[PDB]
Amino acid sequence: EPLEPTLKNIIEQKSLKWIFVGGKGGVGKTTCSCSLAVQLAAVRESVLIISTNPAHNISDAFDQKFSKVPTKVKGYDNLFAMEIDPSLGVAELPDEFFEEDNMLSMGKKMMQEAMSAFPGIDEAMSYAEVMRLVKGMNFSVVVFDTAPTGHTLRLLNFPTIVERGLGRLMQIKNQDQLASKLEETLPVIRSVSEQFKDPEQTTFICVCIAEFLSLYETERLIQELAKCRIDTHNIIVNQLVFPDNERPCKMCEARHKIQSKYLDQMEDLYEDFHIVKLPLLPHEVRGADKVNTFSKQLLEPYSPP
Amino acid sequence: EPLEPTLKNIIEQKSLKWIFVGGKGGVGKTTCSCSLAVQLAAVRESVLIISTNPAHNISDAFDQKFSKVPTKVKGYDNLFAMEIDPSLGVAELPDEFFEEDNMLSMGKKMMQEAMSAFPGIDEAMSYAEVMRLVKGMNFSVVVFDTAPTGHTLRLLNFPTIVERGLGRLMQIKNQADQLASKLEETLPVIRSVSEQFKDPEQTTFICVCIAEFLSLYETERLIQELAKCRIDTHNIIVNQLVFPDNERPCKMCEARHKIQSKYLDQMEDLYEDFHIVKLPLLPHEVRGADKVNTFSKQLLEPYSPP
Amino acid sequence: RNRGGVQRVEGKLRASVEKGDYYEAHQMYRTLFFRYMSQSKHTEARELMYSGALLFFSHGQQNSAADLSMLVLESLEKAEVEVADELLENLAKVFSLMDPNSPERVTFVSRALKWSSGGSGKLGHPRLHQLLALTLWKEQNYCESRYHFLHSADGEGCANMLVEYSTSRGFRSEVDMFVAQAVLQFLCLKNKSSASVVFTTYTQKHPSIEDGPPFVEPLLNFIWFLLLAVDGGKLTVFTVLCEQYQPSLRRDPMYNEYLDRIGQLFFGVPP
Amino acid sequence: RNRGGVQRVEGKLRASVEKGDYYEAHQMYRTLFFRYMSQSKHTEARELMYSGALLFFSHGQQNSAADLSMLVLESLEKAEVEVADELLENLAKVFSLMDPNSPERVTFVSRALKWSSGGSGKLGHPRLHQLLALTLWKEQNYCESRYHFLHSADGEGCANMLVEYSTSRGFRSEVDMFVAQAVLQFLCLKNKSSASVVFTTYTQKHPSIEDGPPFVEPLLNFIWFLLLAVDGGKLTVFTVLCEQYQPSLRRDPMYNEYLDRIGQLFFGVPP
Amino acid sequence: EPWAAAVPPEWVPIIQQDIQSQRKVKPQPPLSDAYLSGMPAKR
Amino acid sequence: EPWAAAVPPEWVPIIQQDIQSQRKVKPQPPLSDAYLSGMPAKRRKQLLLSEAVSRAAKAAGARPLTSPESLSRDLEAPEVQESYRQQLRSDIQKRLQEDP
Amino acid sequence: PQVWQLISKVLARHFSAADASRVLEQLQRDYERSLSRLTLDDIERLAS
Ligand SMILES: Nc1ncnc2c1ncn2[C@@H]1O[C@H](COP(=O)(O)OP(=O)(O)OP(=O)(O)O)[C@@H](O)[C@H]1O
Ligand SMILES: Nc1ncnc2c1ncn2[C@@H]1O[C@H](COP(=O)(O)OP(=O)(O)OP(=O)(O)O)[C@@H](O)[C@H]1O
Ligand SMILES: [Mg+2]
Ligand SMILES: [Mg+2]
Ligand SMILES: [Zn+2]
Structure with a gap:
């Protein structure tokens, strides 16, 4: 009667291009997103994973360091990973063998120096790389890792605000050469914006644990996404504990009852949402083989012994 | 022989004014920060908590919703809490007896509206509140439930870059005077905050982490970044530890204890000259004044498994 | 299910x-x-x-x-x-229950006023302004209460609150000025009827002010004649009154500015 | 502790x-x-x-x-x-080991050059440039290899690499023009001796270039005369050569502005 | 008087007394802050 | 000779021969991509019939009486029209021998 | 005939005679310049 507690819909919906994973910190966004990307790679032609989260962990999750440029993930023929650069791409040859456009380039260099550590620079470069990918159209689907809920919301909000600002700037401009740069970038910007607003093109995966803070922070996140009109109809409950009735200790029992309370709360609260439940594995979840094994149950529904 | 695994150093360092808490998301920054603030409130005359994280949870931690202006915490007299504003001063009551400056009004309105969701505006307004409190001085010490490592480091470095930009502007004075006067007036407070953040006796950073690969090395990276910013930090909070009972240890507890032992030994080897205070995983939700107080009690008393 | x-x-x-x-x-x-x-x-x-x-x-x-x-x-x-009197009453009740120093009330009020017939503008709906002013007056927030009253349409309550406020805080030499200021501000907006009723009520009820339209105080007489002129809308009479009473109007410079608006609003003074 | x-x-x-x-x-x-x-x-x-x-x-x-x-x-x-040949060679080896397309090579190269004789100037220590040029040449990445040689103090290996590059990719009517551009670019920088040695070696060893400085190609003879003239810094001779060989210089328009810098680098022409 | 014609006759008398009062009225003392609270941003 | 005086005498004969030759020689053909990689990369040196004809009309100032959609429909990439690109491929194939 | 008819046949249908001739001659000059613009790399691009 209820929706299937599996992400099978995500795998099936081939029209899906952009997938975002978010929630409270430490719920497992990184591991869950890696698992989802691994599952997708088995179906789509090419899959990318992007860690917008500063101090990126996808390298840790896959136990294989990744550069800013996408690189192939060991053990997979079409899975690629990349860690966004919070800094600007200021690398370049030291200078030409003659004078240059220094009169113009110097202001740009000062701007880069100033904005290198600007608080919003991380998400700004994330949006820049999103635009670059939209231009490239290289990977069939791209998954995202976003650390907090608030900054994920800011990133999702960018397209709208940037498009509005660009439109207003055009109106003020037509009220010299750089105008080209506007018309060059307005289409692509718009192109991504609609994609973020189109449920077919994009979707958002909320991942949470069975606890008060996690549950209600997830609720706030869902409401904010509704405000931004970003589709989302599946949630990953992570780090569940199912007591081994053969040998249930005190802490396991208490944690299980707490998780049961909040999981029943979720079930009542989130009708018409797929609710995929993931147990807390004993061994660490790191490395391609472990991540693949953990992801297998992300599609096949889990059940306690 | 090693450093005492308790935050007693933080409590006794009465000169301490600003306390930051950070680390990998979900390790317990909010709960540990609340516990530390509760402990301090029993010593300092008045302490404050600020939820820098956009998704504020100190309300959830204390089971008592807090406004955007400091408010006393239920069950305490001198403990205040607040949540940073995610928006600018858009709500106001304008006058209408005369024509208004349409150009200036529209410019300010559009600026604030566009900047309302602009990234870092959370950090920008957090810095604004930092300056407001520095002028206010009303509170003895203020703790921050900082956002995850990245944005926290961005915020911490913000004073340096803003001070440098103001210095550049002073170097390029007018080469609209009310704007110049305002810019000149705010320099001393920016300088004061920048200096304070750099003083070990004035401020310190508490790193909180769990016994796992990702959390451990995220904490390591954060520590190195703080060293780059020269922000003092000499104590870590290992959180959510598990100590299986000798009687009936179950499979999951056994494996998790093995993993945590490995990574905790790693931490002990890696972080000499740090007070590594260890907190267990309680069997009940840590929410509400009583639960938080009980949890904080052991945050100062060196915990030892039965 | x-x-x-x-x-x-x-x-x-x-x-x-x-x-x-x-x-x-x-x-x-x-x-x-x-x-x-x-x-x-x-x-x-x-x-x-x-x-x-x-x-x-x-x-x-x-x-x-x-x-x-x-x-x-x-x-x-x-x-x-759509705005409804019962909803306004409910909102005013909620606003009363809030903490005066808590900023949220401001955040609330600005929102509520905006919702109430937003087409009109920042004035919202005069009924809600009257309710808020009454609540503030019962709370002795005289500044904001006066502000809302001015934005309101309840002249009588405004006059009573002004009388109390004057008897409480104002100096003996300012008794008329308050009402005059209020009246002038009421004319900075297009609410002339409110000005008339509030002036009449303040004059009658205030103990320190002697009854009779021919008031002893020059400023009160000036305000009365200005009200009559606005009723007549004659620019020449307005200019005559302004010139004759210049010493009294100089008691507060702001009056001048109000007059200008009034001249624009009721006597065709060029913008 | x-x-x-x-x-x-x-x-x-x-x-x-x-x-x-x-x-x-x-x-x-x-x-x-x-x-x-x-x-x-x-x-x-x-x-x-x-x-x-x-x-x-x-x-x-x-x-x-x-x-x-x-x-x-x-x-x-x-x-x-302090920069020492051993450290420079270690850095060169490390760079050689990296994957050519990765931007990390760009970042590492930029940082190393900045460090290498950081106080000497923005060019960086010539030894690192020369080592990187050799490594890129082995990689057959002729563009960056040539760039570094130009910034390097070595001409002999530069000349050999230029010969190979022109033969592999250059057209029939460009053999002389390659060495012309290399020599002029060297001369715009103060390293005139490198220009001399690279010209000599390229001319002597290039299969399609005849021995004996009196070459068939007028442009190469112009380069020879220009090298001789810069040795004396005679502005009038420089102008004579520029004007007389204008058809040859126009083969590459940029040459023109190159000459300009020469005039002020060695003939004292005001900027 | 030139202005007397504009105003209706019954307004005329009081005005002179008012004028006469304005010719003997002492300077206005400083205004109470309560009064000051009644103006916009500019007070 | 005017400029002969400034230069050393030994250069003058060679300079004379170079001057004579510079007129007999034709201009330099377009630069190769190889050499084109040398100069600073700021200033650098048409199978699509629809694009080519549109560009030519815009440059020459010509305007089709019918909307361009009709013209595009007429040349809707048939084999006979793609004989255009086959002829271009053949032309470049013949010109390749000039400098492989 | 050759490419010139291939272009003129479609041009004259909707262009004016003078406009068609101008477009054709501009196209011919562009083709000549492109042949001048040719390089060893152009072989790969035109082959596709
Ligand atoms: N099902 C699981 N079983 C066991 N450990 C898990 C499971 N899911 C996640 N973990 C571990 O829990 C820790 C937190 O998870 P993870 O780092 O993936 O979270 P996150 O959403 O990326 O957090 P952050 O907000 O810090 O980016 C990591 O050590 C991860 O390996
Ligand atoms: N010692 C503990 N024992 C039991 N539960 C704990 C303990 N510490 C934290 N928790 C719970 O773990 C969850 C995560 O902790 P918490 O929310 O305080 O972390 P955080 O660092 O503030 O999170 P985030 O970075 O996502 O804002 C919450 O349910 C918290 O109640
Ligand atoms: Mg993560
Ligand atoms: Mg938190
Ligand atoms: Zn257990």
Whole structure:
């Protein structure tokens, strides 16, 4: 009667291009997103994973360091990973063998120096790389890792605000050469914006644990996404504990009852949402083989012994 | 022989004014920060908590919703809490007896509206509140439930870059005077905050982490970044530890204890000259004044498994 | 089944409220409100938020009650409910229950006024302004009470509050100026009837002011003649009155500016 | 107050490397680097990072090795180590080991050049430029190799690489023009001796270039005369040569502005 | 008087007394802050 | 000779021969991509019939009486029209021998 | 005939005679310049 507690819909919906994973910190966004990307790679032609989260962990999750440029993930023929650069791409040859456009380039260099550590620079470069990918159209689907809920919301909000600002700037401009740069970038910007607003093109995966803070922070996140009109109809409950009735200790029992309370709360609260439940594995979840094994149950529904 | 695994150093360092808490998301920054603030409130005359994280949870931690202006915490007299504003001063009551400056009004309105969701505006307004409190001085010490490592480091470095930009502007004075006067007036407070953040006796950073690969090395990276910013930090909070009972240890507890032992030994080897205070995983939700107080009690008393 | 979740949520909210888990109850209220607004059950969501806000205010849960009141405003706005006197009364009641120093009231008021017939402008609806002014006056927030009264249309209550405010704070030499200022400000806006009624009431009721339209104080006589002229709208009379009473108008420079607006608003002075 | 934790960490790093847990080993390498730099054991930290980078390269752990090389550069920068041929050759080897397309090569090269004789100038120490040029030439990346040679002080290898590059990619009517551009670009920079040697070697050794400076190509004869003239700095002779050979110079328009700098670099022409 | 014609006759008398009062009225003392609270941003 | 005086005498004959030759020689053909990689990369040196004809009309100032959609429909990439690109491929194939 | 008819046949249908001739001659000059613009790399681009 209820929706299937599996992400099978995500795998099936081939029209899906952009997938975002978010929630409270430490719920497992990184591991869950890696698992989802691994599952997708088995179906789509090419899959990318992007860690917008500063101090990126996808390298840790896959136990294989990744550069800013996408690189192939060991053990997979079409899975690629990349860690966004919070800094600007200021690398370049030291200078030409003659004078240059220094009169113009110097202001740009000062701007880069100033904005290198600007608080919003991380998400700004994330949006820049999103635009670059939209231009490239290289990977069939791209998954995202976003650390907090608030900054994920800011990133999702960018397209709208940037498009509005660009439109207003055009109106003020037509009220010299750089105008080209506007018309060059307005289409692509718009192109991504609609994609973020189109449920077919994009979707958002909320991942949470069975606890008060996690549950209600997830609720706030869902409401904010509704405000931004970003589709989302599946949630990953992570780090569940199912007591081994053969040998249930005190802490396991208490944690299980707490998780049961909040999981029943979720079930009542989130009708018409797929609710995929993931147990807390004993061994660490790191490395391609472990991540693949953990992801297998992300599609096949889990059940306690 | 090693450093005492308790935050007693933080409590006794009465000169301490600003306390930051950070680390990998979900390790317990909010709960540990609340516990530390509760402990301090029993010593300092008045302490404050600020939820820098956009998704504020100190309300959830204390089971008592807090406004955007400091408010006393239920069950305490001198403990205040607040949540940073995610928006600018858009709500106001304008006058209408005369024509208004349409150009200036529209410019300010559009600026604030566009900047309302602009990234870092959370950090920008957090810095604004930092300056407001520095002028206010009303509170003895203020703790921050900082956002995850990245944005926290961005915020911490913000004073340096803003001070440098103001210095550049002073170097390029007018080469609209009310704007110049305002810019000149705010320099001393920016300088004061920048200096304070750099003083070990004035401020310190508490790193909180769990016994796992990702959390451990995220904490390591954060520590190195703080060293780059020269922000003092000499104590870590290992959180959510598990100590299986000798009687009936179950499979999951056994494996998790093995993993945590490995990574905790790693931490002990890696972080000499740090007070590594260890907190267990309680069997009940840590929410509400009583639960938080009980949890904080052991945050100062060196915990030892039965 | 597919909808039993909402009912179970509501029952759990009731149980938590009985238990006193006020913060958890507030969270449950927010969730229920969002779900209802999803189903376009706007009226039910608004009623639930109103009841919850009143309940939290009764228990002193100031912040939670304020948040639920804000949600009430969200329901009214998103549902585009036409202004109704009962809704204004409810909003004023909620605003009364809030803490005067808590900034949320401002945040609330600015929102509420905006919702109330937003087409008119920042004036909102005069009825709501009158209610807010009455509430503030009962709370002795004389500055804001006077502000709202001026934006209101209730001349009589405005005059009574001004009389109390003058007898409380103003100096002996300022008694007329208050009403004059108020009257002048009332004419900075197009509310001449309010000016007439408030001036009449202030003159009659105020003990320190002697009765009789031919007032002893030159300033009161000037204001009375200015009201009569505005009734006649004769620019020449207005200029004559302005020139003759210049020493009195100089008692406060702001008066001059008001006159200018008045001249524009009632005597065709060029912009 | 240390208790031998660093030694235990080092042992664990060794064990992890022996186990084939490369990523964890790289993490421990970073940790050890920072710990050592705290103790100011700059030389030991640099040696450890260099060895680890070589090890990771040997096993194909590209990104980890590149990160460790970046750490080597960080150690050199912080320790303010005077440039020495051994360190430069180590950096050259490390760069050679990196993957050509990865931007990390660009970043590492830029940082190394900035460090290399950082106080001398923005060009960087010629030895590093020459080593990078050789490495790129072996890679057949003629563009960057030529760029570095131009910035380098070596002409002989530059001349040979130019000969090979022109033969492989240059057209029939461009053999002389390649060396012309190289010589003019060298001369715009103060390194005139490099221009002389590269011209001599390229002309002597290029199969399609006849021996004896009196060449068939008028442009090459012009370059010869220009090299002779710059030795004396006679502006009138320079102008004579420029005007007379204008048809040859126009083959590449940029040549014109190049000559301009020559005039002010060696003939004292005002800018 | 030139202005007397504009105003209706019954307004005329009081005005002179008012004028006469304005010719003997002492300077206005400083205004109470309560009065000051009644103006916009500019006071 | 005017400029002969400034230069050393030994250069003058060679300069004379170069001057004579510079007129007999034709201009330099377009630069190769190889050499084109040398100069600073700021200033650098048509199978699509629809694009080519549109560009030519815009440059010459010509305007089709019918909307361009009709013209595009007429040349809707048939084999006979793609004989255009086959002829271009053949032309470049013949010109390749000039400098492989 | 050759490419010139291939272009003129479609041009004359909707262009004016003078406009068609101008477009054709501009196309011919562009073709000549492109042949001048040719390089060893152009072989790969035109082959596709
Ligand atoms: N099902 C699971 N079983 C066991 N450990 C898990 C599971 N899911 C996640 N973990 C571990 O829990 C820790 C937190 O998870 P993870 O780092 O993926 O979270 P996150 O959403 O990326 O957090 P952050 O907000 O810090 O980016 C990591 O050690 C991860 O390996
Ligand atoms: N010692 C503990 N014992 C039991 N539960 C704990 C403990 N510490 C934290 N928790 C719970 O773990 C979850 C995560 O902790 P918490 O929310 O305080 O972390 P955080 O660092 O503030 O999170 P985030 O970075 O996502 O804002 C919460 O349910 C918290 O109640
Ligand atoms: Mg993560
Ligand atoms: Mg937190
Ligand atoms: Zn257990």
